[PDB]
Amino acid sequence: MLKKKQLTVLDLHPGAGKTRRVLPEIVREAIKKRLRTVILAPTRVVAAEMEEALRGLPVRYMTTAVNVTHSGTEIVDLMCHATFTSRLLQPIRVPNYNLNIMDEAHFTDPSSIAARGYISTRVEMGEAAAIFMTATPPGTRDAFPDSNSPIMDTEVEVPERAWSSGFDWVTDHSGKTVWFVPSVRNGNEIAACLTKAGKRVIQLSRKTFETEFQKTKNQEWDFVITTDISEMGANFKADRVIDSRRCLKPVILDGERVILAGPMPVTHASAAQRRGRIGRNPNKPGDEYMYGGGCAETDEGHAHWLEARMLLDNIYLQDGLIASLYRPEADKVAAIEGEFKLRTEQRKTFVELMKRGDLPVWLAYQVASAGITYTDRRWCFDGTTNNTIMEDSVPAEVWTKYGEKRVLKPRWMDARVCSDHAALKSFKEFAAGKR
Ligand SMILES: Cc1noc(NC(=O)CC2CCCC2)n1
């Protein structure tokens, strides 16, 4: 496993103990061999759970999700997927880790795909070893993998709107349900319907995950309404998963705008991970998985793989060489390696628009490659009229940094900047020069 030029896919079924049993074995083995090691957690929630499984082992925790005084002599680093890729993009020294361990290595967010591309390229160059930990490696066709205890799989019509009748099985349940919805706004409507029915609902999304997930432990609940973010190692004590089997897909249209297409079927990997939230207790057979559609390989043409190429094109590897995508997922995008390579100043802008600016990768690239500096926000208002951002059927309005009320009308339209109320609120602050 740990010998150089080796990439190992640890593809044990969900709940088989890859994180709490195998990972500590690997780490103390790497420490014994004096292997400089990075451990990549998908979320800060998983990072904290890793500290529990690795407590007592000398691990440097490069995340504020853990309150640990470090000795400085640790050769094992732990950080989130996004942090790894961020540090590669920034002008700071990143060690050339001899061992690279990515947990929940199926994560399809751009910074996770890029991290796999960079790591797998170093392995292919014979410079490092890597272990990708996931029950669902890229290209999985099995949406019903093995589990610790038998699961009741039922294909059933699943609501995606509020309902008044026809779905008694949803509310008649007396256990705890994790419900995968295609979007935040879709989850809002389902959540309000359940709450009106007397249910206690917790809602999880990417922006609220590292805070709202604590509620699943601190208070009692009946339903968790979650987007696909809970595919990344989120553990619940539930006995039922309701799966719409649907997701949104960011799609670049004509190379000039990003739309959120769908909802449309999830991949087999996503369906397996959603189902894999339950059936994890061998002493509690008969957890239920209700799914409301089929699977399809909807990661092809998905904007995240193009955005991953935008990131990797701007990460130094060796002279002019450029890291390739991890080969099992390299065909999901039609992109020329290097075509998004920016020069020094435009690359700095690109990085700042993604970090401080909190813009989607694709949008950050359009602005940076147009030669616009980070604080120049005139592009948020000089787009075409079809690019007018709407909220509550009225055009969105902000006060510009000059003190002028203007309609939000970005030169490049990325639907992710206004996918829900919170997203648009953040983009309005950006357009106003507030960060
Ligand atoms: C999903 C999604 N939304 O935005 C992003 N941005 C990035 O992954 C860029 C990386 C990560 C941190 C800074 C550099 N991914």
Swiss-Prot record:
The impact of changing K207R is: Diminished RNA-unwinding capabilities
Q: Where does the UniProt annotation locate this protein?
A: Host cytoplasm; Host endoplasmic reticulum membrane
**In the record, which positions carry N6-acetyllysine?**
K207
Recorded coiled-coil stretches: none
Q: Binding of ATP: at which residues?
A: L12, H13, P14, G15, A16, G17, K18, T19
Lumenal side of the membrane: what ranges?
A: 1-435
Bilayer topology: Peripheral membrane protein
Site (described: Involved in NS3 ATPase and RTPase activities): R274, R277
Domain Helicase C-terminal: residue ranges: 150-329
Q: Where is this region: Important for RNA-binding?
A: 3-6
Every Helicase ATP-binding domain range: 1-155
Q: How is it modified after translation?
A: Acetylated by host KAT5. Acetylation modulates NS3 RNA-binding and unwinding activities and plays an important positive role for viral replication.
The short motif DEAH box is annotated over: 103-106
- What quaternary arrangement does the UniProt entry report? Forms a heterodimer with NS2B. Interacts with NS4B. Interacts with unphosphorylated RNA-directed RNA polymerase NS5; this interaction stimulates RNA-directed RNA polymerase NS5 guanylyltransferase activity. Interacts with non-structural protein 2A. Interacts with host SHFL; this interaction promotes NS3 degradation via a lysosome-dependent pathway. Interacts with host CEP63; this interaction disorganizes the centrosome and inhibits host innate immune response.
> What does this protein's UniProt record list under function?
Displays three enzymatic activities: serine protease, NTPase and RNA helicase. NS3 serine protease, in association with NS2B, performs its autocleavage and cleaves the polyprotein at dibasic sites in the cytoplasm: C-prM, NS2A-NS2B, NS2B-NS3, NS3-NS4A, NS4A-2K and NS4B-NS5. NS3 RNA helicase binds RNA and unwinds dsRNA in the 3' to 5' direction. Leads to translation arrest when expressed ex vivo. Disrupts host centrosome organization in a CEP63-dependent manner to degrade host TBK1 and inhibits innate immune response. Inhibits the integrated stress response (ISR) in the infected cell.
The name on file for this protein is Serine protease NS3
